[PDB]
Design a protein around this ligand. Structure first.
Ligand code: NA
Ligand code: NA
Ligand code: NA
Ligand code: NA
Lengths: 412, 206
């Protein structure tokens, strides 16, 4: 517990940019792109007010658009007078991917009509299209093969406080060991993480901070409409914060909270607000109505595990069940607890052979050990109940491919 | 199954894609359905065997579906999953191993079910080729059939050896195959693929 991320003061003008969304639309061969930037203001609407959105690659300004406020007519009452959507054409845009993380810089200027700048905001833009088409998850028209890992925000000395140096070390080690994707298990990360994934090239699953695993049954809160407002803020505030990051390719509704009607509601919310990204959610059997992707945890390649209401079919069998058409990407597999990752090659043989088996996310990246000190001062790696904490689950916090100091285990 | 196999053609659909042969193929299909449509044991119609995939197959598929909707239509030719079949019905597709032939691949039957846009059941029209000392790996098929719901079985090739009896100079009969009658060019012992001998005594594979 505690104030474990940054604290900041932000000064804005009274007439201000209050929100902006960046969408990218493409033609079928991705040779022409439209950047659609929707900008919202708060404060006094004046007729002199303008928004310019400029697109930059390195130093060259590629696209610009200038418009007063005023949206198109939305319904019988009209449109948003405090919003404006600019459309910029980009011919042959450098597309973003984990292999080649091409980024543009979008600048959003709130300025008067005689050209006086009031406030600017900006974001990195990656031109990419994420879509599920004919049962496959495509990135820029090509079927992805997810070489993923789950990653908690853990530091053995600072606990759950993340710093840029540890984030960069994790990303470099991940890319050096042929990962292209990371799942934010199980919460929105530090805001710098998505920037670094934009710039280095990792696909990100951004996951709402919702896990109700200890409930009995698991969906006792997530099927209760009294908890729908609390769950709705964990999902909607994540999408409002992170929807402009190109590295985020999939939204997750959370983790291990059964399947309740609140999940179905928040699934549909995200699909309405941000259609550019698939939504996944494992809970309640990995293939519910709240997920676009069959995303089981620890389903085996060839062996069924026929649990009574939430069976874990073999991933080959799961794809061909009657009426099943979605791609399958394991949100967790190959549990790397200690001397582990036996049978890892069987998964990757199956991923390469089967088109709708599009990979998965290893559990997990880094051991959650903490450092304690012996009486002579020597540090040592501690787990579970080494702090007097009871009840505890002992060494089960250490499931990593790397030690907490980021030294690799042999499984890596 | 209709009496249509054009396997020796090059390519295999040279006649079945020709509309000049559509009237001849149409009589082999339509006269079979008119003769046998009241039998309850007939549950599936087949358009024939090993004749590629031509437009005549698509036509006669749709004919049967219009005249007798009470029975599925299947046809293996041209890759086992064409528009002329209601059932993915490959011959000798393996359980786990793909055989990626250029235009007519034989996917592993587990993989074939989950290909994008594939929803039909899969029943092998031929599998487990029982030529001589054979049926090795037969249990792997039946493990797969029991585990996967849309793997609904198949038809072993085949029931009885096609040996014929000849007689030695002292009168003793013996089982003959291929070119034992002066018939050339023949294919020798490939006519004997049975689970039972031609006198219906069982092979050990049975
Ligand atoms: Na695949
Ligand atoms: Na654990
Ligand atoms: Na079956
Ligand atoms: Na034969």
């Amino acid at each position: 517990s505690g104030i474990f991320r940054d604290v900041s003061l932000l000064h804005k003008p009274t007439t201000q940019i209050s929100d902006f969304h960046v969408a990218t639309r493409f033609n079928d061969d991705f040779s022409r792109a439209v950047l659609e930037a929707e900008v919202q203001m708060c404060g006094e609407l004046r007729d002199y007010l303008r928004v310019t959105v400029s697109l930059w690659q390195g130093e060259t300004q590629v696209a610009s658009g200038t418009a007063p406020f005023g949206g198109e007519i939305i319904d019988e009452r009209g449109g948003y007078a405090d919003r404006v959507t600019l459309r910029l054409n980009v011919e042959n845009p450098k597309l973003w991917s984990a292999e080649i993380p091409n980024l543009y810089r979008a600048v959003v200027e709130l300025h008067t009509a005689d050209g006086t700048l009031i406030e600017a905001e900006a974001c990195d833009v990656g031109f990419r299209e994420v879509r599920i088409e004919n049962g496959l998850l495509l990135l820029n028209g090509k079927p992805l093969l997810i070489r993923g890992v789950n990653r908690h925000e853990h530091h053995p000395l600072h606990g759950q406080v993340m710093d840029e140096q540890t984030m960069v070390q994790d990303i470099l080690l991940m890319k050096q060991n042929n990962f292209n994707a990371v799942r934010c298990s199980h919460y929105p990360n530090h805001p710098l993480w998505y920037t670094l994934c934009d710039r280095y090239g990792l696909y990100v699953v951004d996951e709402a901070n919702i896990e109700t695993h200890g409930m009995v049954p698991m969906n006792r809160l997530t099927d209760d409409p009294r908890w729908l407002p609390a769950m709705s803020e964990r999902v909607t505030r994540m999408v409002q914060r992170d929807r402009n990051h190109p590295s985020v390719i999939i939204w997750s509704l959370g983790n291990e909270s059964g399947h309740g009607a609140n999940h179905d509601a928040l699934y549909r919310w995200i699909k309405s607000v941000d259609p550019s990204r698939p939504v996944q959610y494992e809970g309640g059997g990995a293939d519910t109505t709240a997920t676009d992707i069959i995303c089981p945890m620890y389903a085996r390649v060839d062996e069924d595990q026929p649990f009574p209401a939430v069976p874990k079919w073999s991933i080959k069998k799961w794809l061909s069940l009657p009426g099943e058409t979605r791609p399958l990407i394991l949100c967790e597999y190959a549990h790397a607890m200690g001397n582990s990752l036996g049978g890892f090659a069987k998964y990757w043989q199956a991923f390469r052979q089967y088109p709708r088996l599009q990979g998965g996310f290893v559990w997990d990246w880094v051991d959650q050990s903490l450092i304690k000190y012996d009486e002579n001062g020597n540090p040592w790696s501690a787990y579970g109940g080494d702090f007097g904490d009871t009840p505890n689950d002992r060494q089960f916090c250490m499931n990593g491919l790397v030690f907490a100091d980021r030294t690799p285990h042999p499984a890596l």
